[PDB]
Design a protein around this nucleic acid. Sequence first.
DNA 1: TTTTTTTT
Lengths: 362, 362, 362, 362, 362
Amino acid sequence: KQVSWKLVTEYAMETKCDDVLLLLGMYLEFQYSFEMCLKCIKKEQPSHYKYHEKHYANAAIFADSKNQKTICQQAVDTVLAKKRVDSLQLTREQMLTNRFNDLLDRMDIMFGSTGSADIEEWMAGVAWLHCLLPKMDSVVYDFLKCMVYNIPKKRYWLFKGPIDSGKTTLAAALLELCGGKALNVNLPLDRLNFELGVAIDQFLVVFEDVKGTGGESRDLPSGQGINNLDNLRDYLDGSVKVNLEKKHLNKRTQIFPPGIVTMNEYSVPKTLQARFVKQIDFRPKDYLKHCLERSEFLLEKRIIQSGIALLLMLIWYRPVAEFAQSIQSRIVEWKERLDKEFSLSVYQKMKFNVAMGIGVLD
Amino acid sequence: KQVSWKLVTEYAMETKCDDVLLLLGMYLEFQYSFEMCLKCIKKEQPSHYKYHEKHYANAAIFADSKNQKTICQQAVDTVLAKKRVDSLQLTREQMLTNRFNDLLDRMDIMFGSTGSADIEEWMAGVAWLHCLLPKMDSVVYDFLKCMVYNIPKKRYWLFKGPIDSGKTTLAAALLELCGGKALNVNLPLDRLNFELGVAIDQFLVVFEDVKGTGGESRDLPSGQGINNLDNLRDYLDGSVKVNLEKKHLNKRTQIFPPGIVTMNEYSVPKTLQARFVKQIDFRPKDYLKHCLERSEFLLEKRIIQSGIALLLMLIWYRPVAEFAQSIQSRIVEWKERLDKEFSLSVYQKMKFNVAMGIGVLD
Amino acid sequence: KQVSWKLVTEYAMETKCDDVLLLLGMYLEFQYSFEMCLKCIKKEQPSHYKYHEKHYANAAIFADSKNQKTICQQAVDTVLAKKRVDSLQLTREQMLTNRFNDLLDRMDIMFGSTGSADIEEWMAGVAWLHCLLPKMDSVVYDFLKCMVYNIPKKRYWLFKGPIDSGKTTLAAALLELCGGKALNVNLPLDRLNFELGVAIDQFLVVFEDVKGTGGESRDLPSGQGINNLDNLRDYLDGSVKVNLEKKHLNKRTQIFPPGIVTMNEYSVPKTLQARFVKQIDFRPKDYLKHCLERSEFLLEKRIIQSGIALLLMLIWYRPVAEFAQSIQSRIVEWKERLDKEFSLSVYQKMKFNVAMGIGVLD
Amino acid sequence: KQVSWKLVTEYAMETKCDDVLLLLGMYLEFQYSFEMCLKCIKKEQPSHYKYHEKHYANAAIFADSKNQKTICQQAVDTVLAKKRVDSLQLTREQMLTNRFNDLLDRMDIMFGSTGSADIEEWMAGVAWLHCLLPKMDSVVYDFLKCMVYNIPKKRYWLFKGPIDSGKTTLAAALLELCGGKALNVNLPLDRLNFELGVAIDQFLVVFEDVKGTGGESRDLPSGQGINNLDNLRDYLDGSVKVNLEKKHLNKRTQIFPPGIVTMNEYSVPKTLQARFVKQIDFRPKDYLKHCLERSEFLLEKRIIQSGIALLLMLIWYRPVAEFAQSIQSRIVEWKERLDKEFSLSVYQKMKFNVAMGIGVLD
Amino acid sequence: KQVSWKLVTEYAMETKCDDVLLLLGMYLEFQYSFEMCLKCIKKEQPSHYKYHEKHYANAAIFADSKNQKTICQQAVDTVLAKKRVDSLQLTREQMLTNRFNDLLDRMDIMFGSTGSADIEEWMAGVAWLHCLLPKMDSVVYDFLKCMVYNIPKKRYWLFKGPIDSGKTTLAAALLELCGGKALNVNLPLDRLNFELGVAIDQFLVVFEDVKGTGGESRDLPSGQGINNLDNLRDYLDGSVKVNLEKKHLNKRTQIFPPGIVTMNEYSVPKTLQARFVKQIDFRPKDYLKHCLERSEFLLEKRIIQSGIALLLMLIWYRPVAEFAQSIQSRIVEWKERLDKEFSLSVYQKMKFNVAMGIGVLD
DNA sequence: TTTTTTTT
Ligand SMILES: Nc1ncnc2c1ncn2[C@@H]1O[C@H](COP(=O)(O)OP(=O)(O)OP(=O)(O)O)[C@@H](O)[C@H]1O
Ligand SMILES: Nc1ncnc2c1ncn2[C@@H]1O[C@H](COP(=O)(O)OP(=O)(O)OP(=O)(O)O)[C@@H](O)[C@H]1O
Ligand SMILES: Nc1ncnc2c1ncn2[C@@H]1O[C@H](COP(=O)(O)OP(=O)(O)OP(=O)(O)O)[C@@H](O)[C@H]1O
Ligand SMILES: Nc1ncnc2c1ncn2[C@@H]1O[C@H](COP(=O)(O)OP(=O)(O)OP(=O)(O)O)[C@@H](O)[C@H]1O
Ligand SMILES: Nc1ncnc2c1ncn2[C@@H]1O[C@H](COP(=O)(O)OP(=O)(O)OP(=O)(O)O)[C@@H](O)[C@H]1O
């Protein structure tokens, strides 16, 4: 009897898998009886245990096929095709709404009964991030709106301050929240071509550590990044399309995505200042350092790195109307859960502890 | 029963799709019942909702096919083949009229009932453009004729001005009007061959912001572009065919298309000055800036960059006789629609606002 | 019922088509009923309307086929095979005799009933070229003999003169006449591998304004041209076969075609001077410039740079016996037609106008 | 019925055709009735007219096939396989006597009833060649034996002489005689590696006018030649096997063939100079120039380049016993034909005219 | 009836053929009746005549196959797979055992019934070899077993002594017995990086004459080699795996093979000295130079640098027990031959002639 | 697999 290529393609769509080998390997695991399957019983991986019982019959026949990689290629093509349709048709608001739904699904697992995470430790994360800058939650909301509208010239934000000011932490969490890539412009001009190629079809980009020149007056090591950026005015202003390249691929043409620039305290040309909507200053604060010393489960579990943490911050702080209408129903349910799990007193006690530089938990 | 490859080829032809993935992903959407298709019901994408009901039955059988990518490959070849045939057989005038017919079709949507655009905002853009240079509409007509005639050694226009003088803004609109590609020649000579490969079958090209050398006298940064360009005289001259290269592809041979060069105020070898038929200065002007500050919906919606804006300018200013015969019927209808919606006093009020540096509207 | 691959192959032979996409595109057009084919009715393209009615029946079945690119590939291979057989077995004189028949067929169309070309404008071009150098028609006959005889190390003609001397204009018309390729050697020395690979099976080649050195004294900025050419002395000399490369293709070994090099007046090593059997000096002459200004239809229709114009010159000036026997019949008919449609006094009126620098016509 | 791939492969073997396009084109000619075949009637090409009648029936069925290139690919591989088997199993003497049989077969045609060449002209070529250097036949006999005995570090001879001093003229004739390949050194080693791949299964090679250094004192521009030569000492010695490259096909390990190198008077490292038995070149004899200038059919028909002229020279000069045994029958047969058609006085008359530098065929 | 793919695969295994073209060509030869087969009658090649009669029936059907190259590709894979299994599985001792068997077969070739390598010229080579320096057969046996054991640190010998001293000559012969390569180090570090990759997968290696920096105090001209090697601590010791690299290719990781260093009388750091098991110095000798001058047949049939000339030297001197335990059979059989063929007096006469520096084959 | 990338 025949293999159903359709059931494979459906699994690939549902897992959103787009590596042929990863797709292949996982489907083969279903060939053993789901009824006895230790991976099912131990509830180890949702992309397995949700699916094993459904695909078992087809996996058994798949295991005898002689066409195995051919089946997988067509399946993976279907997933890649769906992505490109979406890229050309969705609004940036819908893109972000989809991205949020993905994170919310991961949170449902993380804090589920199977969930290994501790919602209390993750709320301790939110308390620390809310102390990193004044009006942190309002600042995030502004950044997101700026990315969604993608208004030309009004596109780019500058993070400034010394080593261990925290700027890379916040960049990483934002980059996880929205999706995107880091880029390093400190290179010589020739390699920048493939470097910028990374930006193709991304939502955000982040420029790391754009080294100035002459900051060595204050021990900052000098480099070319600032000059290179000043030579990229149209990529930043985003008013017109640019060509982009990848290794072994022909060029594509698109609006270069919005993003973030990060630096230590180099001097900035006025030509470059004009490019930026907003500059945010990061300054070392000892009470955060002493708090982290006593609350290091934050670092160990990478809580303060994660977009998941920022999403919890938005859920706790923002009015429901601020979210895209479709997901507002899920947001209410999470707000309800958090209101059940914590009183404001509990949360504010944590904020006080952080201000003391004491460990977050008491 | 079996897949009709013919119906897929029709869909590719009618959508003018030439990406195999986009074609695939699009066609797969039709497999669900159009009668419930929310994309149809919400009238979100014409390249969907026009076609779903027609293609539905074949899409269901296509969803079961084991050959899916081969079927799409043949369809995409047919669309590519038609472009090839046209490149060798249309007059340059006919090409331009086809291109115009497509923009006019897009304008029909944008200002339709489903049309989101405000014709008053788009007409405001024409006022700002007609201020950017003396006799602006005459300049556009002269450029269009030059591009149609494609007279050898009389093929290229040079734009000069300081930064923020509007040259790349104007180049963008012409390029969207005619269709074509931008190119960057401030490069090492080795990559340059794959760079020039982009010009294949294009109508225009634009060489963007070519760097001279010694312009640091004027504080200009310096680079290869001008010296690199003087090695390419025959590409400008267009008197003879040249050979063009793409990655993993053997060379094509054709005449290199006509176009535009933009730069800040470097000096130039007259071996290259001889190649330019015309040179246009651009100058910063305060009232444009002050007007634009109070008119930022122009920038937010990219109106000022977009070829639709130049087409609207021509329809307003130029006689019907100057358009090629077949489109004169549509041109007449659009002229009637514009005149119905705008008095000369309204248009002159807008122009007077721009001159005064108030926001365009009042 | 099934596709005749034989009928397709025959059309590719008939058209001498050798791009698979161009072949595919044009054969598809025959699917619609020739009974109403607007292209046929408008008599626009010979390669269509001559063939549509014959191929229509087979094109309808081709339109359904699943193999389409494969059928086209075999047809293109048959045309390519015919070219290789010919290149290995014809005398160079027969090759040229065939080329002349193809041009004469095009002239029969151009000045035929459809008659898109005015023979008066075309003859005005002949007067302009015959004025460009002394004894012009004698010089063309010398060049043809040289290319036919292909005497080793007596194989190349050098054109020198300042900008707008007309050297490219003459080279362009000659290249069209014989059929051949232009090539750029002002290039990085590695990429020459695939560049020169284009010369496979060609009859004649041209190198462009080849960037030398020493001319910096006169603002000729220098480059790899003369450097590279003084390497390839064997390619010029043609005493031995050389290996030529294409992408995804193993090398072809053959003797390298004769031809022409063009030069603004850089310096040349005498190892290279030894290899040009002849050099011609070209000079700007204002009265030609004044003539062109008033006679711009020459440039706009590209008349003066077409081998069609050179063929008309030879028909006017040379004895019938100088042509190969099989075409002497066609030559006689065109001599008669020319004598009918022009008196000598008209041609003398034209040539006088050219000398005066006024508009050629009066 | 169906195509006999066997009959196709026989033709490929008997033509020794080893290009798939050439073979394809050739065989398709046979599809017409040979009984009226104009080429047969003309006796135009032996590789056609000998075979048309035999292959006609199979060619008709071949003309309808859908596998045509695949059939030709298998046939071509049979021919290459035969070459590869000979390339290892035969002695260098056995190879050479095969080569001579092929040339003798051409001469039988060239002076045959078609007789398109006249042995008197070719004899005048012999006279010019034997006049070019003393005892030319004897120095050739030395070179032949050296190449058969193939002694390492003694596998190569050089010419270092001036331009237009004939070294290429002689190399061409020897290379035609031996059936080697020319190769080009003057390249980046990072691609020369592939070019050397052509040396697979060759009797002999020649390296061309290789760019040294220090020749700059006499305007010879320096380059990669000297560098790449003194690098490849293994190949120059003939020390060991090398894995020679091919595209889309495996590389092959085999020992490199012996050869010749030409240059003008560049530097040569003594580390290189060690590797050559003879390092000898020859310099202009102006009277010969005046002879050529009055005997130009010699050059026009390329007689003095062609290995056929050398073979005629050895037939005249050498003892029958100096040839390999089996061909000595044919050697005697041709010695008869020379002595039948020429007196010594005629040959001497040619040779004094040559030495006098005058036109020869008085 | 049908081609047995099995029989084709047997022949490939038995011949150890691993080029698809050779396999194809040779197997096709069997298609003629073996009963008359003149290659069999002449006993030209065992790879033919040993097999033809067995394979004949299958070869006939093979010649009619339409699939031929596909059969051969699978057969060649079988032989390559066999090598890769053994290459991974077996010991250095087993591998040398087989390398002996190969070279003992080349003795069975060279001194088989054709004797085209004269066993006694090869004895004169053995004489010149053993006369070269002290105790040479033992010095070989020692160095050989040293390289078989590959014991850490105990892995490198230093061949000092001047130009033409023979050190290069001998290493080449041992490399014939085992494979391997020589290596440069005389360069700045960026060169060394890629150069070190040459050692990858070598069963043995050597270093080219180290022009040691700091040898110029001895007036020995130099490059960086001494400081290079003195820094390369591990590579010599072979204590642990190291990484190796090539142009355009990824890194590989392996224990760096053992070997030899060659130099003239250069300066050495005592650290670098500690890396070597033996210090040796070679010198040119007046008897030996005048002997080869008088005995050049040893150069002509490639003897003195041949590994077989070492193999014969070992079969002469070394007892059967010193050879691989089963190959010892062949050792006895060649001992029988050589001891029968040559008296010790002719061997001693030959050695004495070398001791007189006079021609060996008196 | 070639190519492009890499290497320069
Ligand atoms: N505001 C802060 N005050 C004190 N310590 C901080 C602060 N922010 C971050 N840290 C400490 O700095 C460490 C590194 O943080 P992060 O990488 O975000 O800093 P950064 O300023 O972006 O650094 P860099 O510029 O070097 O990448 C954190 O793990 C934390 O220990
Ligand atoms: N003539 C002008 N006078 C004043 N402001 C101008 C003028 N032209 C453009 N602007 C302002 O400058 C911005 C940038 O315009 P644009 O990018 O076309 O300038 P440019 O000088 O042509 O740039 P570049 O040469 O770098 O491509 C516009 O969006 C507008 O805000
Ligand atoms: N002899 C001439 N006298 C005056 N004008 C000329 C002459 N020859 C050409 N022209 C003008 O010069 C233009 C360019 O001619 P052409 O390209 O053949 O010259 P060129 O010397 O080969 O130039 P370049 O070095 O730029 O390639 C022609 O289109 C014509 O307008
Ligand atoms: N000895 C000679 N006497 C007179 N003319 C000669 C002589 N040798 C060569 N020539 C002339 O030189 C022409 C070119 O010869 P050839 O190409 O063989 O020389 P070459 O030394 O190899 O030159 P190059 O290195 O420049 O290619 C010959 O066709 C002939 O006209
Ligand atoms: N000891 C010797 N006495 C005389 N001739 C020798 C001796 N050794 C080698 N030869 C001859 O000299 C040639 C070169 O020897 P070889 O290259 O092995 O010496 P080398 O000492 O390694 O030289 P170099 O240090 O110059 O690279 C050999 O091929 C052989 O013909």
